[PDB]
Subunit: 237 residues, 4 copies
């Protein structure tokens, strides 16, 4: 069904499906079983920042995740996105909880995409930046349990009145406008995304994670993708 | 019905509805009868550039139109857009022909909108730039006779195979994503738009013009808005 | 000597030289006696944000100052900068203390300048953004007591080891590269600046203020411009 | 002496110093003998566009050169610039002619550099764009025979009144402000440069080429670097 390319900030190690034995960042190409992962020293209750970059010349998707006053974690994977995704896609953020839980709060999100053609000065670009989310954010498609406006933040998964995260929750937010990632005369296509998040859990074992993803424009949450599937995949294959 | 704020590049003087006796640029606030106009030395067959700027502190909508090697024309109007438009709008380009005609070709179009909140570093932004249009431009809503792809350009009104402009034509192109122009905690909201166009006509009297506009998100071409109504207004009041 | 255009965040009311009886924001055109002022509810110890905007079509210099959770203050003044400043200028921040004192800490500073020519797509631009300052910031010219690096901030005036602000201090920081604000074929020139600051004082009467300024490229701190003269003017005329 | 990293658009094959037998694009790390090259189908008299990109996560310097209606050429090289260049550098364009000649005209030049720190939202950036050059371009350091203003272009090497390129010429233009490419707390540093050029020669064998380069801030044209040395290297080692 959906074609998904995602960078996961996986908080819970599901060693039975290929996760390493610790929280990690990974690059998922059409499967929850990451093509590449890196140990991530996740900090419960602290605001982190993720940066994702890619360009069609190098064909390498890279991500860096950091917390203030700490060393960052980085993961890269050689992949030609032209061979994986359609030329028009939507970009978004996804998150889930299962038996274990955590808040999956997004405080800001920016994205820039550029397509430079062989025509002199021919540059097509799209850029958006959210540092504040309102209750009625018309330029975002919210799916599942995702809501905006609470403290000006985007809550990807269910959080009750008292601020407590709920289990078995899944939610995604996609930018309204389709994004053009390939064009026949483009000499270089590139994108960069940045988002800050706050993962907090009253438990010693938070779950399940947050993911930045790129999909077919009509992507929807697959049935039963709560928990380990991050609201992105229908199964663990 | 629709709420329209537009900057018109009016090529045909309809003196019976308030147009001055020459091609002109004007600022239209909910009516085709411009609140302010300026003489425009239109050049048949030459590529021109229009710049439109506005900010919520000054509350002045200004536009500058120029052609290479020539003096520009500028028009400004004091207007508080918060009092005219809804907080969420769509932006676009419109054009028409009637008994007289011209090509209403758009070669490039960029737009930037910013909302700066009272929160330290709280900036929400949207920016798009098209220097090339493809046949299937999924991030544009095309209405009426508007088409993309021909020579990588956006043709707002009907042009036949041989490049000849057709009469009684009307077309508009709006950016797919809604644009947020007001927010309760914004201290300054601003936008700037730029587009280059090519108006060419085999006749001594081309018509009718091109307009950059901002409207309610669900705006559609009003019935019978070809010709002098620029595909924006239902009547000449 | 120097030609100065500045937006002052004046913390001390020197009613003898024209200041109103309260902290205020003002627009200074070649004189410390502001052409226009607005009451400013200054908050000792809180981080504020100032936004300054201007364009050559409207010829209006406007500034907005705000603190989180508070209403902002705004001041505007109609002035054609082409008639006041040379075509090449330097932009910077200045601050001073006198018998009364305060810290004049800058946490971030961004500036964007654009010159759009009548040539199709002819845009010249300069943009810089500092969200962190290092000890050896080679792209800034520091004058007087200004230093960078302390906590990644820019300290415009002298602050001793224990964090206490010192009196009779003056310092300025200018961006290294000259900025082009006028060009014979420009149809529109514009700029926008934003900076966040932290003014803190152990006294009930802090002084003297911070100013964003634009000057001739070779501008230097005038002799005896500590205190009420904000490190910008040689006298109070 | 100078530390140079450059992307050369080499028009003349000096097979005696390692050039392949055809015009080519190459990546030079402290030596004119390119670490990597790619065949370049140079078009005499046509305006081309070069794009150069790099980021500290991937540590790969890549360049793409294209002409309208033609396939592009691309070259990449894995190199960690932190290990080659100082933390503060200047960026520029260089060109030369020798016994053979060509015009080395630059029509536009843009550059963007970003340093993202581990602090939430800590981004330092520098961006400049020249689409028009004036006679007195104060934000550029011109070395050798380089001049600005002629037709609003930057002429890197000597061209006589009649538009004819002169031999044994060398010239460079560097942006005035130093550029910060490394900082202890940066999690990702990146830059992208784009320039359009016009190489024209009345001869069948034009020479010698144009290069985008990054150097120590105080870099100057090495003695005798006309011709094959591109105004960048003191010798052919
Ligand atoms: Ca997992
Ligand atoms: Ca008319
Ligand atoms: Ca005062
Ligand atoms: Ca050579
Ligand atoms: Zn995983
Ligand atoms: Zn009219
Ligand atoms: Zn004052
Ligand atoms: Zn070579």
């Amino acid at each position: 069904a959906d074609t998904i390319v995602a960078v996961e900030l996986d908080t819970y190690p599901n060693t039975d499906i290929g996760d390493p034995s610790y929280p990690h960042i990974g690059i998922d190409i059409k499967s929850v079983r990451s093509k590449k992962t890196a140990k991530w020293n996740m900090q419960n209750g602290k605001v982190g920042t993720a940066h994702i970059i890619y360009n069609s010349v190098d064909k390498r998707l890279s991500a860096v995740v950091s917390y203030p006053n700490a060393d960052s974690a980085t993961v890269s994977y050689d992949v030609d996105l032209d061979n994986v995704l359609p030329e028009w896609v939507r970009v978004g953020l996804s998150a889930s909880t299962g038996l274990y839980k955590e808040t999956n709060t997004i405080l800001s999100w920016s994205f820039t995409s550029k397509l430079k053609s062989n025509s002199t000065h021919e540059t097509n670009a799209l850029h958006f930046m959210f540092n504040q989310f309102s209750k009625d954010q018309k330029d975002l498609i919210l799916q599942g349990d995702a809501t905006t406006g609470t403290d000006g933040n985007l809550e990807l998964t269910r959080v009750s009145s008292n601020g407590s995260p709920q289990g078995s929750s899944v939610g995604r937010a996609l930018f309204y406008a389709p994004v053009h990632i390939w064009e026949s005369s483009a000499v270089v296509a590139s994108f960069e995304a940045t988002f800050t998040f706050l993962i907090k859990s009253p438990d010693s074992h938070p779950a399940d994670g947050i993911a930045f993803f790129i999909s077919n424009i009509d992507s929807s949450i697959p049935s039963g993708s709560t928990g380990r599937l991050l609201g992105l995949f229908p199964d663990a294959n």
